[PDB]
């Protein structure tokens, strides 16, 4: 599939850069027939089939597919794809308020109402990726961004699909591995993949948000996925002595190692707390 070829500079003007990925760069633009803001995300192509340098065009062409199928609150739209020789430049719906990352290094940690509030969002985005069969494989707070932070209750929207792939089969079994902090087990061991990993990465993100403290961290990559793959980890009183038995109850049953005895994100929100790269 081939994308428009124009140059975007005659029908966007950029502005501040917003974040720099690996192989990516987002800048604020704005669309001048109708001034509309944007983020155009740049992803470099690979200059040859062989190349590590620079995204693959299937693995380009699979996040543009994604991101097209999907409208919801709290996912990140796209409004137009161009590329040229060096990139191809996705024009995203512009977010903000900054990552969840940035917004929880001010507070420290969340009280759980204002964990939930946010912790509800997520997994009503997931809920809508879930039931569209869409694992997105790369859930973690710099990945969650806020529409306004300045707001008692900011509002949430997940970015960046570009680990993200369809599960027509219940798993797949490619090569994909996000950021060891919050891969799955079975994302350490190498086995067959599917939408419980996104589960156990909710797990984690919880864990965080309720303590500010990362559960599987280790002072290395190597070290941080064997804990995982271990399930290494444990709710310290200092963190959790006043954090209530129930959001314990949530994060134990997502953080567990097989992934058909993880809850689902039907299971999650049903749940009584809620209910109303890899190398060095
Ligand atoms: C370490 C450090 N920063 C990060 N970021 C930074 C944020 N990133 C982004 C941001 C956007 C985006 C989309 C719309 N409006 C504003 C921004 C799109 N795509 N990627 C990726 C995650 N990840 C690890």
């Known amino acids: 599939t081939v994308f428009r070829q124009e140059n975007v500079d005659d029908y966007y003007d950029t502005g501040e850069e917003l974040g720099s990925g690996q192989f990516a760069v987002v800048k604020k633009c704005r669309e001048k027939s109708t001034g509309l803001q944007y983020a155009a995300k740049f992803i470099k192509k690979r200059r040859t089939k062989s190349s590590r340098r620079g995204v693959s065009r299937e693995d380009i062409e699979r996040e543009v597919s994604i991101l097209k199928e999907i409208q919801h609150p709290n996912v990140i739209t796209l409004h137009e794809v161009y590329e040229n020789k ?4 996705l024009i995203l719906e512009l977010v903000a308020g900054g990552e969840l990352f940035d917004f929880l290094a001010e507070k420290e940690s969340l009280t759980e109402e204002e964990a939930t509030e946010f912790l509800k969002q997520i997994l009503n985005g997931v809920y809508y990726l879930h039931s569209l069969q869409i694992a997105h494989f790369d859930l973690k707070p710099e990945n ?3 529409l306004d932070r300045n707001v008692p209750k900011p509002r949430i929207k997940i970015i960046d699909f570009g680990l993200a792939h369809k599960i027509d089969f219940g798993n797949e079994f490619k090569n994909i591995f996000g950021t060891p902090e919050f891969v799955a087990p079975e994302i350490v061991n190498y086995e067959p993949l599917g939408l419980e990993a996104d589960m156990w990465s909710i797990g984690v993100i919880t864990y965080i948000l309720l303590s500010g403290a990362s559960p ?36 134990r049953r997502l953080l567990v190692k097989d992934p058909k005895k993880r809850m689902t994100i039907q299971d999650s929100l049903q749940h009584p707390w809620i209910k109303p ?4």
């Open 86 to 89: 060096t990139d191809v430049i």
């Open 144 to 146: 969650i961004m806020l």
């Open 216 to 251: 599987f961290l280790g002072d290395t990559k190597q070290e941080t996925l064997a804990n995982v793959s271990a399930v290494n980890y444990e709710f310290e009183d200092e963190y959790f002595s006043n954090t209530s038995a129930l959001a314990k109850d949530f994060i």
């Open 277 to 280: 790269p890899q190398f060095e």
